[PDB]
A paper describes a structure:
In eukaryotes, wobble uridines are modified by Elongator, a large and highly conserved macromolecular complex. Elongator consists of two subcomplexes, namely Elp123 containing the enzymatically active Elp3 subunit and the associated Elp456 hetero-hexamer. The Elongator complex harbors two copies of each of its six subunits, namely Elongator proteins 1–6 (Elp1–Elp6). Decreased levels of wobble uridine modifications lead to ribosome pausing, incorrect protein folding and consequently trigger intracellular protein aggregation and proteotoxic stress.
Meanwhile, we also collected a dataset for ScElp123 in complex with yeast tRNA AlaUGC and obtained a reconstruction at an improved resolution of 3.96 Å. This new tRNA-bound structure of ScElp123 allowed us to build a more reliable atomic model of the tRNA-bound complex, which facilitated the structural comparison of individual regions in ScElp123 and MmElp123. Although we did not supplement the sample with SAM before vitrification, we identified a bound 5′-dA molecule in the yeast active site next to the cluster. Gln257 contacts one of the hydroxyl groups in 5′-dA and positions the radical carrying methyl group in close proximity to Tyr136 and Tyr327, which both are positioned in a similar distance to the base of U34 and to the methyl group of 5′-dA. Furthermore, we observed that the density of Tyr136 connects to the one of U34, suggesting direct interaction. This tyrosine possibly pulls the uridine closer to the iron-sulfur cluster and the 5′-dA molecule. As for the fourth iron atom of the cluster, it is not coordinated by any cysteine residue but it is bordered by an additional, adjacent density, which most likely can be attributed to bound methionine. Second, the ScElp123 in complex with tRNA harbors the SAM cleavage products, namely 5′-dA and methionine, in its catalytic site.
Numbering used by the authors:
A (entry chain C): 17 to 490, 505 to 557
B (entry chain A): 772 to 1310
The structure:
RNA sequence: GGGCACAUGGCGCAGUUGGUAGCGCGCUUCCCUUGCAAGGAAGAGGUCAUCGGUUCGAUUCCGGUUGCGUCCA
């Protein structure tokens, strides 16, 4: 027949590999060749894959033999599987009180697309997954985690992302339902009450190690921050796009830069970690001001956020930019010019700031004018090497990508500690790194809760240092070392009586063995 | 970490007890007696620069130590000198001694036993089972399986002669319980010696299996399981290394070993082993298949006065096929009792003096005109024939070795060699196949496109499609010229074989009073051996 | 049953004595399933089905073996 011999070929491959691996012996010819020698007796197009054979192993043998094919730390060991979901399409808040929507957001509810949420084009993989789930969080989460399971990953720490427009502009009942649904699809609990859902997810297997909620500076007030900390949010993503007030004004942005900075301060003093969006090639900017703002961003001790997202301005049909690009009022950059600009910007990224992404993955056939290729960071790093300078980004110095791309191993770990001042607070940045090769092995941020901006009833009662983020990628007793040094710092360097770590609800038990007791939404510990 | 020893090893080793007392947590001690790498960090690298001069090169880039090195370092490693073993043994001495340390710091001792390169897991599992508990012992087994591979530790548990520990470990090995539970049950419900035999079988320890199966029965009648086992595995050496006590059973092993040796390859072993068992006809067969005429025929004449000459016929056939005309003549004259045939073999083996002896012995001087003079004439003929043939071969060899004639230069000139024409350096890809090939090498070839080892020292060959060229890079037939000596040896072997024969035959023929041709052929032989280009310029 | 064109990355192909490493899919990796796509980039998978003598050269020449169309008497 056509395909039956393929199924029985996979079956014999599975049984033979299990038998060989029980006593500790490897294969010889990368089973696909052995697969064909039996299944392609007539050569009827039977093409297996690694996922195909993985979905054949029996459960008892699957759960024990699967990770013996993957070894990248963040891939299967650290296992922070970024599982992105989307909310129902809706119109972003500012449109009401200004008159029109942001002038560069493609898609939405009233664009040429009837189906994609705001700032989305309904062609990214996430959009098709959302629509094939009809924007329901339960199906989204279950399907994504199941697809990840099928592809042979041993995922154990799901990290949620809530993409799409401003999620914070929805009726409170709807958001409560969304978050409860996410946690339920993770843990398996089938309840409806946010408190119970959190309490169940905390014990859950497949821990919800956090959740990110991209939002707007205005919709991040005290009450909104309390809401998102109730949900379990751990990292915020804030739209900025410009430090020049004129650009924000001309883009129908609807929020002043001063508002952005105030929101940064109060959120970082609420224990969050903020990742900001920074659009180059905004109208009326030019290369000189582009470089100026990106050089000030890390120089002004007011923004200095921990993450970043460089999103070069892409014009797409239907936006407010098509009725301005067609008239020729605005012309984009040049390919070489923009690659060089990205190179110079990345040259200035301090070691603590992590570059989470570069230019959007909106498809080439749809963009009217902007970035040509889709591998901008590749060319940026090549041009960086050409110029001589090098990148200090966390993502460009973490162990995991090095072991598979650079194929360089770490052997000179040493303790390094930065100590800067951002958003009115004193932020320490501990790390275990490789000074000779500039490889970051583990990191931990830390902040002295500033009197001016802190507001949480847990923090204003007594002096407090917040462990805003702890991350270990590639014996291996590092989290312990970093946590101990942070304790020492908060006891002597900071003079704080109670040190508390914000944590995703999934990982709240890990700090339990460290002696932390659960206070509100934080894992705290007195000193 | 390891530093703490490599810096002041003498003082450290002195105060290891103080150090252990200092380190409070068991965890630190544990994970310090595991990361002991056999490399130093104070005299091979990370030099203390406090005392070095400020103008010295502080440090160069350490080399990557290309993979191949590790191959002849792990096999060159000496497990008696390594620092790891020394510190492990010191720790073991300071820990096993005090009862309190054994009570508490057990996991340290387990780590030490599993860390030393000889991997003393036997002592580790022994001490683990020796604990009188069911809570800590299982914890330590789990710790060991996390540390050391579960399969090897389970095999060591078997080798420790315990099943309960083996079953406890086998719950961490992921093997199907159907594949070991019946095994462990069968091991459990048997006698100590049967269980030990089965244990030593499963690990493959055949010698232990036999040396523990032999002791199951104290009877003088040997078992048949033992002989079946040794026959299946061919370990009779341990059979005779174990039963040096019981003569009768040792003779049983002699019998089975003799059968084995007679079957597989070799024969005098079978005869000398049958010497104890007697095995008359088989002993005779082994002796005569060994071409040992005298011993077999002595056994015949001392045992069988009926087949004395038939074995003599077999031996004379062997010696005629062996072309050993000396013992052939001996057994012909003494046993076959034929002086004429004995002298014929004497002439065949280029012997005349004893041939004259034998002709005199039968009071027969006619034999000279019958065989001896014809035999000497044939000897003269064959020496003349070999003279001419070897002279022609020498001419051909010299003609090939006329001169360098350039041609091949890419090979180091030891490839030429040939009476030290020129020295050489290293070696290049083996070229110049049969009879002066060229080395255009425009392309890589049909069997080409890869690297070439560069092995033209003097000569070489490759297995790529199995040679298929008669010139297997060797100095023989259709030789490729260019041979550093070893072509003289092709002639030296023959002339040294014939030279005692040459002088013997010429002296014997001189004794017969035809010394003209004798001295003629002697002088011709000395001339042809002299004029040979022996090595370089006859030096 | 023997002659017999052919038998060559998993697959259909360029295997060539003036003269042997790759085409199309297929698989693995990263960019990226908007941290891991079944696109694009970049690689791993082989010196012919064995051997004998000569050529810068050898299942590549000749010789026979196991199948793939095929007989023939
Ligand atoms: C999702 C992030 O991308 C920004 N953004 C909005 N429109 C575009 C576009 N056309 N291309 C790239 N990024 C865009 C949003 O303003 C936010 O900063
Ligand atoms: S600019 Fe901000 S608020 Fe406006 S559509 Fe884009 S994401 Fe929504």
């Amino acid at each position: 027949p056509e395909k039956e011999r393929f199924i029985q070929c996979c079956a014999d491959i599975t049984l033979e590999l299990t038998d060989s691996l029980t006593s500790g012996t490897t294969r010889e010819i990368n089973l696909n060749g052995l697969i064909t020698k039996y299944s392609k007796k007539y050569k009827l197009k039977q093409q297996p894959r690694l996922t195909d054979i993985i979905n054949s192993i029996p459960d008892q043998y699957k759960k024990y033999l699967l990770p013996k094919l993957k070894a990248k730390p963040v891939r299967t060991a650290s296992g922070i599987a970024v599982v992105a979901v989307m909310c129902k399409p809706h119109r972003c808040p500012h449109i009401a009180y200004t008159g029109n929507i942001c002038v560069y957001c493609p898609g939405g509810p009233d664009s040429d697309f009837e189906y994609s949420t705001q700032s989305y084009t309904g062609y990214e993989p996430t959009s098709m997954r959302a629509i094939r789930a009809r924007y329901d969080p339960y199906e989204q989460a279950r399907g994504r985690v199941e697809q990840l399971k099928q592809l042979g990953h041993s995922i154990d720490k799901v990290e949620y992302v809530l993409m799409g427009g401003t999620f914070m502009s929805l009726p409170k009942e709807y958001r409560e339902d969304f978050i409860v649904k996410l946690h339920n699809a993770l843990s398996g609990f089938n309840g409806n009450d946010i408190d119970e859902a959190i309490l169940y997810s905390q014990q859950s297997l497949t821990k919800c190690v956090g959740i990110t909620i991209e939002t707007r500076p205005d919709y991040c007030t005290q009450t909104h921050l309390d809401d998102m900390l109730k949900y379990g949010c751990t990292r915020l993503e804030i739209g900025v796009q410009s430090l020049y007030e004129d650009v924000a004004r001309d883009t129908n942005r609807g929020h002043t830069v001063r508002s952005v900075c105030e929101t940064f301060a109060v959120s970082k003093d609420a224990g969050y970690k903020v990742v900001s969006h920074m659009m180059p090639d905004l109208p009326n900017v030019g290369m000189e001001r582009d470089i100026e703002q990106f050089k000030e961003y890390f120089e002004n001790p007011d923004f200095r956020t921990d993450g970043l997202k460089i999103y070069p301005t892409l014009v797409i049909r239907g936006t407010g930019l098509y009725e301005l690009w067609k008239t020729g009022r605005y012309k984009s950059y040049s390919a070489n010019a923009l690659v060089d600009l990205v190179a110079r910007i990345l040259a200035l990224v301090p070691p603590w700031t992590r570059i989470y992404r570069v230019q959007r993955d909106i498809p080439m056939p749809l963009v009217t004018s902007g970035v040509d290729n889709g591998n901008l960071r590749e060319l940026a790093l090549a041009r960086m090497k050409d110029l001589g300078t090098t990148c200090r980004d966390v993502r460009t110095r973490e162990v995991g990508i090095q072991e598979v791309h650079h194929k360089v191993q770490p052997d000179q770990v040493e303790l390094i500690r930065r100590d800067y001042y951002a958003n009115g607070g004193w932020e320490t940045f501990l790390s275990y790194e490789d000074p000779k090769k500039d490889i970051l092995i583990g990191l931990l941020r830390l902040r002295k809760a500033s009197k001016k901006y802190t507001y949480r009833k847990e923090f204003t009662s007594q002096r407090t240092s917040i462990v805003r983020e702890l991350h270990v990628y590639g014996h291996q007793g590092f989290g312990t070392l970093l946590m101990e040094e942070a304790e020492r710092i908060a006891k002597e360097e900071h003079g704080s009586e109670k040190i508390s770590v914000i944590s995703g609800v999934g990982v709240r038990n890990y700090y339990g063995k460290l002696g932390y007791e659960l206070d509100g939404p934080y894992m705290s510990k007195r000193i | 970490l390891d530093i703490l020893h490599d810096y002041a090893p003498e003082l450290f080793i002195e105060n290891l007890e103080v150090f252990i007392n200092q380190i409070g947590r068991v965890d630190y001690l544990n994970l310090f007696i595991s990361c002991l790498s056999e490399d130093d960090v104070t005299k091979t690298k990370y030099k203390e620069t406090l005392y070095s001069g400020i103008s010295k090169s502080f440090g160069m880039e350490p080399a990557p130590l290309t993979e191949m090195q590790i191959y002849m370092k792990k096999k060159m490693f000496d497990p008696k000198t390594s620092k790891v073993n020394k510190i492990c043994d010191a720790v073991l001495n300071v820990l096993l001694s005090n009862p309190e340390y054994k009570k508490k710091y057990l996991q340290t001792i387990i780590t030490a036993y599993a860390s030393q390169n000889p991997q003393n897991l036997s002592a580790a599992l022994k001490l683990i089972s020796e604990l009188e508990n069911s809570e800590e012992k299982d914890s330590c087994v789990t710790y060991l399986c996390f540390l050391q591979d579960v399969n090897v530790v389970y095999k060591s548990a078997l080798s420790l002669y315990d099943v309960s520990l083996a079953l406890l470990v086998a719950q961490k090995s992921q093997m199907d319980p159907r594949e070991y539970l019946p095994f462990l049950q069968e091991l459990q419900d048997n006698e100590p010696l049967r269980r030990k035999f089965l244990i030593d079988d499963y690990l493959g320890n055949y010698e232990k299996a036999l040396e523990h199966l032999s002791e199951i029965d104290k009877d003088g009648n040997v078992s048949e399981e033992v002989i079946d086992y040794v026959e299946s595995h061919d370990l009779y050496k341990h059979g005779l290394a174990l039963y040096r006590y019981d003569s009768e059973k040792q003779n049983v092993i002699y019998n089975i070993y003799a059968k084995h040796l007679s079957s597989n390859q070799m024969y005098t072993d079978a005869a000398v082993a049958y010497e104890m068992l007697g095995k008359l006809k088989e002993a005779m067969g082994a002796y005569q298949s060994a071409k040992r005429w005298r011993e077999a025929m002595s056994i015949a004449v001392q045992k069988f006065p009926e087949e004395v000459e038939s074995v003599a016929e077999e031996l004379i056939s062997s010696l005629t096929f062996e072309h050993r005309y000396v013992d052939a003549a001996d057994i012909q004259l003494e046993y076959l009792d034929n002086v004429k045939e004995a002298v014929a073999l004497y002439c065949k083996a280029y012997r005349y003096d004893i041939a004259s002896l034998v002709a005199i012995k039968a009071k027969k001087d006619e034999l000279l005109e019958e065989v001896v003079d014809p035999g000497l004439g044939e000897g003269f003929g064959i020496i003349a024939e070999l003279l001419a043939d070897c002279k022609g071969q020498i001419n051909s060899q010299l003609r090939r070795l006329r001169e360098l004639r350039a041609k091949k230069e890419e090979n180091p000139y030891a490839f030429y060699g040939q009476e030290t024409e020129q020295a050489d350096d290293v070696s290049v890809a083996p070229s110049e196949t049969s009879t002066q090939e060229s080395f255009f090498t425009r392309y890589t070839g049909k069997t080409g496109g890869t690297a070439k080892t560069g092995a033209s020292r003097r000569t070489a060959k490759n297995k790529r499609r199995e040679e298929r060229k008669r010139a297997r890079g060797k100095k023989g037939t259709i030789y490729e010229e260019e041979y550093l000596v070893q072509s003289v040896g092709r002639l030296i072997e023959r002339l040294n074989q014939t030279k005692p024969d040459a002088v013997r035959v010429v002296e014997g023929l001189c004794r017969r009073n035809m010394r003209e041709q004798a001295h003629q052929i002697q002088k011709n032989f000395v001339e042809v051996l002299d004029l040979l280009k022996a090595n370089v310029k006859e030096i």
